[model samples]
Target chain A: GDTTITVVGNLTADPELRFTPSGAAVANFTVASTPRMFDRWKDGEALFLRCNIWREAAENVAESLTRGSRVIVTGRLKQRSFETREGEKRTVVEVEVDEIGPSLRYATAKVNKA
Target chain B: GDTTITVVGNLTADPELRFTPSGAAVANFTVASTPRMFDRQSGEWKDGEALFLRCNIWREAAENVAESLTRGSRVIVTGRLKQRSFETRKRTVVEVEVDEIGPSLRYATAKVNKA
Candidate 1:
């Protein structure tokens, strides 16, 4: 499934940037999306999604985003599996991002080339 | 908090259209989002939990969607999350307050009616 998705959320923490031994740029971060409606039932509910971006986009993401920054991410959903210490298998869903940038709805950000 | 999201998925079923007593149109449907990957070792790509979202479109958008879509039709949706919880059941069902929705160009084409 080549499903495309977009998420607008706040960064849960500062983004981390790393490089593959092959020198591929990779950036990882988590975003927390909250409900728009306010009521007793959903007082503090949110869905946290981990996002990954590669190449020049990764470098740009790390430089532009920070803890508490609001952003909109466009990407595809992916599933990754890993083995735990107990040898049990776990599958996690992630957003493999194609584009990410600051959201102007809440705040304004300046943009330029790296 | 205000958040916007876009989801591209197949319709789980044919949409249901209704009208409020005030005659406002409403269209309700569900979309299932699937993962993209095909790793043989982990088998994570075999299949994963499909994020099924209940969506609501009002008035003109509602009518357009009903006429244009059906079960299993691929679509792209953009919206904000709306939470609906049943108190006694203690279950929270999230819905989308749709901002815009349309057929994905991958599988189909659309005809637009102008104002």
Candidate 2:
């Protein structure tokens, strides 16, 4: 089984949408999350994670989310390995989005069925 | 930075509460999550296998967890994932260092209180 996780964070930029050769829609975006401080004096470091979404939800993410939008995302963690032009092998961990929504903690959203 | 994650699942057992030598409270428990998969042949969603995770929450939240939750309670748990290593052939285990947790309202409602 894969590791599934949920992250609450803000979008660093607008989602970029692309289509596969089979005409399947896919969108990519990044989220920046800062852990809450448990103690009064110290703060935790922020984490920036890239996320990928597919199909109808990809289109929805492109339409509904924008830069600085706070969102709650649930997904599986995936590690991809690739070689750079300099011939160095690199591994990156990314999120494969399953569900995403605007956070209702400090704001209200008008629901629309797509 | 840490590997932070949130899990929505049911408690496998009642939480175990303990205090450190310095008087800090901590609670330990396990959660079981089952993903749903679509079966194209049957045109229905079927339950996938379950993933059980061990979790630890600290301080005031630990006491709150002990007071509010029990076996079979569904919860939304947010935390950092930590990997621990053992010496015999280098066995590694992943555990959660919980930051926040609450009852999931999908199946039940909760009365809010301040501690």
Candidate 3:
């Protein structure tokens, strides 16, 4: 019942259009977001998030997105962490998108680089 | 990215642990959160919110989260991280990950009561 909005800096890779074996439409892809300010990326941090959209939602996004596009991903913040067999620990938190679109849709020049 | 934590009140009913046909373990359920506050008081309101969480419970903690947590039950969900629109509308908001455990859970704890 609570949510917040903020600008994210990133590039969208080529869209991966596919469907589950059950026949649900899905468009999977990755978002390259940089953590460089306030609390996200302080000094050293990896900057990127993997995203997947399913059902009619995917259809809507693919129609408006393209490779190397810059957009905003709005959704839940999910964190996952695991340990390697080598005894190293790893953690990742990605924004699972509920909504997405160009950051400056119809306002500024479209972004063209990754 | 942006993330803010507030003391949220809700009820966790059933905890279904399952997998996709592809063997992806997913525990799906609904969280009944309320929509009233005074910020305190009977400030004149009908209270509640619909919270759907597609959770993955694969380890030790999974043992404790089960169904039957009643209505009117409350828990200060520590990890209340979310961004964007609830529907399929186009929205772009954000929340970065927090390496911390939670903001704080001061809300009174009670079991949800569903009839």
Candidate 4:
């Protein structure tokens, strides 16, 4: 499968990273993107999308990202199911990211590979 | 919104373009993206989960997409995602939007005639 999704937005919080029991790296974070134009119909239009990264990308995000840092994230959208206390199932959509980096549009970034 | 999505897939049909009364350009088309995987438990890829995106392009991008592509051409599109909702006979309709698009060099190449 091929999906190219690039998101340029500010992170709402610091990147959170954890390891699977099998010792693979994974990280999760949220990005807040607001429209540049004013639209009366959309009333304070902003989209808060949650993103997940894996392997080396996960480690890189944990090292580099912080709250309110502008970034570019590219990935695929995946859906998962959750169970509530009332025994109801619900679906949640999140981005499964492959590549993420500083946007470098509004500010400069130094790059050194790990 | 600062949304960027890139899709690589086959166009399901030819790009359809039309003009507003004010003469602004617009085009619409669909892309079919299927997962590339096989599962022993499932016996096959869940191809039914293939994403069928209804995309719109405007202005110069609209003209280029209509001219360079047709059904079954693989392309890469990167753009902001805007969800449009409106009341209709059955329910609210929402659509995804694309602004920057081009042919994928992974499948083909072309000379750039800059404007």
The candidate that achieves the highest DockQ relative to the unseen native structure: 2
Q: lDDT by residue for model 1 over A1-114, one digit each (tens)? A: 688777767899998999999989898999998867666654456888989888876776676668887666778999888778977989899998865655433332322322
Per-residue lDDT of candidate 3, residues A1-114 (tens digit): 534333244456776878788988887767775554556436446557677666765765565566665555556766788779979989886565654544321122211111
Worst 10 residues of 4 chain B by lDDT: B105-114
Residue-wise C-alpha lDDT for candidate 3, range B19-70, written one tens digit per residue: 5687654443334444653335556665556544322233322323333223
Q: After superposition, how far is residue A77 of candidate 4 from its true place, in Å?
A: 18
Better of 2 and 4 by DockQ: 2
Off by over 4 Å in 1: A1-114, B40-45, B87-89
**Each model's fraction of native contacts:** 0.01, 0.01, 0.00, 0.01
DockQ of 1: 0.03
With a 3 Å backbone cut-off (N, CA, C), the pairs that clash in candidate 3 are A35-A41, A75-B83, B35-B48, B70-B112, B70-B113, B71-B112, B71-B113
Model 1 residue A61 CA deviation (Å) reads 29
Alpha carbon lDDT of each predicted model? 0.73, 0.77, 0.45, 0.68
Taking candidate 3, what TM-score does its chain B reach relative to the real chain B? 0.40
Q: Is candidate 1 or candidate 4 better by lDDT?
A: 1
Best by TM-score: 2
Write the number of the candidate with greater DockQ, choosing between 2 and 3.
2
* Native contacts present in candidate 1, fraction: 0.01
Give the distance in Å from residue B1's predicted Cα in candidate 2 to where it truly belongs. 2.0
TM-score of 1: 0.49
Candidates 1 and 2: which is better by DockQ? 2
Residues B1-115, model 1: lDDT tens digits:
7676787788899879999999988999999998776777865666766799998988866876776678886666778998887888278888998876655433332333322
Question: Per-residue CA lDDT of candidate 2, range A59-87, in tens?
Answer: 76777678887667778999988789978
